[PDB]
Amino acid sequence: PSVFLFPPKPKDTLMDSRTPEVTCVVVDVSHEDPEVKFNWYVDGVEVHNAKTKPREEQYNSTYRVVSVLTVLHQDWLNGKEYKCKVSNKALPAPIEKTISKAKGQPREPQVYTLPPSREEMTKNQVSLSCAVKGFYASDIAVEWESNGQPENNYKTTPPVLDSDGSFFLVSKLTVDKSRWQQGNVFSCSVMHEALHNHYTQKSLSLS
């Protein structure tokens, strides 16, 4: 059996109303030795506000035991390291993994909206684009709105490392050509730690 450690979701660390969690996942737990132990440490000191989630049975007769430790938003953003220690009979030793936020000076996203190409104006649905570039580190959230309400027919590329060490991505919202032609306003909402209030939004409409 092997251990895998996962950071919080980007949006979770950026809004106080959300609950960021580090999650320790362990797999290949044979039914013969299905009892697993966890121990969590934050910046070298042990912590006890963690929990454990109910297990499952994978298709290969191996259990998948998990444990989520709730973290302070500011703890994670300030760089603290999260060590998860895993002990079991079938493992010769206690496995450990330490994870933290990427190191370095945060850099603010620049957000640019791009209207659909005229060539796409022959289709019944058109593509609205939100370029987000120059940000560091790569944790970011992007979503779309119209008239203050969610526009969910969108997909966003992962962050891509640019030649200057910052990241970019593009979000693509697909809407009915009719909606774009009447002049409705669409908005691209970006959250990132380096933005004021962790949030910014840019609009896009037919001129």
Ligand X SMILES: *[C@@H]1O[C@H](CO)[C@@H](O[C@@H]2O[C@H](CO)[C@@H](O[C@@H]3O[C@H](CO[C@H]4O[C@H](CO)[C@@H](O)[C@H](O)[C@@H]4O[C@@H]4O[C@H](CO)[C@@H](O)[C@H](O)[C@H]4NC(C)=O)[C@@H](O)[C@H](O[C@H]4O[C@H](CO)[C@@H](O)[C@H](O)[C@@H]4O[C@@H]4O[C@H](CO)[C@@H](O)[C@H](O)[C@H]4NC(C)=O)[C@@H]3O)[C@H](O)[C@H]2NC(C)=O)[C@H](O)[C@H]1NC(C)=O
Ligand Y SMILES: *[C@@H]1O[C@H](CO[C@@H]2O[C@@H](C)[C@@H](O)[C@@H](O)[C@@H]2O)[C@@H](O[C@@H]2O[C@H](CO)[C@@H](O[C@@H]3O[C@H](CO[C@H]4O[C@H](CO)[C@@H](O)[C@H](O)[C@@H]4O[C@@H]4O[C@H](CO)[C@@H](O)[C@H](O)[C@H]4NC(C)=O)[C@@H](O)[C@H](O[C@H]4O[C@H](CO)[C@@H](O)[C@H](O)[C@@H]4O[C@@H]4O[C@H](CO)[C@@H](O)[C@H](O)[C@H]4NC(C)=O)[C@@H]3O)[C@H](O)[C@H]2NC(C)=O)[C@H](O)[C@H]1NC(C)=O
List contacts with a second copy (CB under 8 A).
110, 112-117, 119-120, 127, 129, 131, 133, 153, 155-158, 160-163, 168-170, 172, 174
Least distance to ligand X from the beta carbon of 125, Å?
A: 28
Least distance to ligand Y from the beta carbon of 175, Å?
A: 28
Least distance to a second copy from the beta carbon of 111, Å?
A: 9
Q: Tell the residue number behind the tokens 């121990």, with chain if given.
A: 39
Cβ nearer to ligand Y, comparing 58 with 153 = 58
Cβ nearer to ligand Y, comparing 6 with 112 = 6
Least distance to ligand Y from the beta carbon of 25, Å?
A: 5
Instruction: Give 43-87 as a 3 state SS string.
Output: CCEEECCECCECCCECCCCEEEEEEEEECCHHHHHCCCCEEEEEE
Cβ nearer to ligand X, comparing 82 with 180 = 82
Cβ nearer to ligand X, comparing 40 with 180 = 40
Q: Which helix (H) or strand (E) holds 203?
A: strand 199-204
Of 138, 127, 187, nearest to 161 (Cα)? 138
Q: State yes or no: residue 58 binds ligand X (CB under 6 A).
A: yes
Q: State yes or no: residue 25 binds ligand X (CB under 6 A).
A: yes
Our measurement of the distance from residue 73's CA atom to the centroid of its chain's CA atoms, rounded to an integer in Å, reads 14
Tell me if residue 95 falls in helix, strand or coil.
Answer: strand
- 140 burial class (0-12, 13-18, 19+ CB within 10 angstroms)? buried
Residues that bind ligand X (CB under 6 A): 2, 4, 6, 23, 25, 27-28, 58, 60, 62, 64
